[PDB]
């Protein structure tokens, strides 16, 4: 239970909601040409350089 | 049944017991699996489908028997002693009880009038100096040398 401030928690929330797959409708729109994403990650890896 | 693990965890939470204390009826498996909420788990608990198994303690009767024998003074010999004499009976505690007994005896004697102040001072210092083993020894010395103002 490390204690974050408002901005630190906001940046963690941004990282969390960035950690999402590309939408299937986006894949359909791009015709399976944008399927990947540079901000995908896992929580148990090299940590965020955000906090 | 699918996983009853969620139901078992919720039931352990509702009963305040450990996870393995929770007993789920192996016949009412679909009845348990239908239970999703705390209220459903409480209903199963009240109707007996879910219950907390009895705690299996540690019985103490065969230690009570040994404690009774040790109170009587048995099962406590040299072959049973393993800590040092001093770890089993602290010397300050021994001295404290001895000196307090002697002091209370002298106080009661001076209160009831068997002991005047002049000899009381010397007897108190003798006791503080360890001349007397116990209240019985003190009384024996008093009766031997006639220190009590008998009447």
């Amino acid at each position: 239970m490390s204690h974050n401030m408002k901005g630190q928690k906001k940046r963690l929330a941004k990282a969390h909601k960035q950690n999402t797959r590309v939408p299937v409708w986006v894949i359909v729109k791009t015709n399976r040409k944008v399927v990947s994403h540079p901000r995908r990650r896992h929580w148990r890896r090299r940590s965020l350089d955000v906090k | 049944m699918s996983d009853l693990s969620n139901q078992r965890k919720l039931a352990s939470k509702v009963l305040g017991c450990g996870l393995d204390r929770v007993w789920l009826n192996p016949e009412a498996s679909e009845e348990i699996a239908s239970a999703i909420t705390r209220e459903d788990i409480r209903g199963l608990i009240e109707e007996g489908t879910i219950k907390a198994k009895p705690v299996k303690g540690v019985s103490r009767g065969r230690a009570r028997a040994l404690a009774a024998k040790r109170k009587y003074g048995h099962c406590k010999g040299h072959g049973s002693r393993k800590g040092k004499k001093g770890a089993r009976t602290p010397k300050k505690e021994q001295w404290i009880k001895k000196i307090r007994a002697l002091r209370r005896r002298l106080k009661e004697l001076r209160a009831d009038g068997a002991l005047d102040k002049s000899v009381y001072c010397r007897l108190y210092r003798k006791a503080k100096g360890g001349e007397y083993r116990s209240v019985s020894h003190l009384n024996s010395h008093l009766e031997s040398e006639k220190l009590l103002k008998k009447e």
């Binding site: 408002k6 928690k9 969390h16 909601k17 | -």
Partner: protein, 82 residues
């Protein structure tokens, strides 16, 4: 600048209607005083208390407890929740 974004309609948020509380997604810049005054201006109901938390979506949620009975139901009906 309105602090109230919109009523928050999830299962737990709908559970507030039966205790006369109403949950809102609000501006994270604003505070409890601004949220209370803005809600009172918006719906004409006297607010008894405001509870606020920040989420991991970067949002701020406020549960408002009203003073008038049925005020939460009436605001939900006015919005279109009920």
């Amino acid at each position: 600048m309105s602090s109230i974004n919109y009523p928050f309609v999830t299962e737990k948020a709908m559970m507030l209607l039966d205790e006369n509380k109403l949950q809102f997604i609000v501006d994270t810049r604003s505070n409890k005083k601004q949220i209370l005054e803005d809600v009172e201006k918006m719906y004409g109901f006297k607010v008894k208390s405001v509870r606020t938390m920040t989420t991991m979506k970067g949002m701020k949620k406020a549960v408002l407890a009203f003073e008038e009975p049925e005020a939460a139901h009436e605001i939900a009906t006015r919005i279109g929740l009920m």
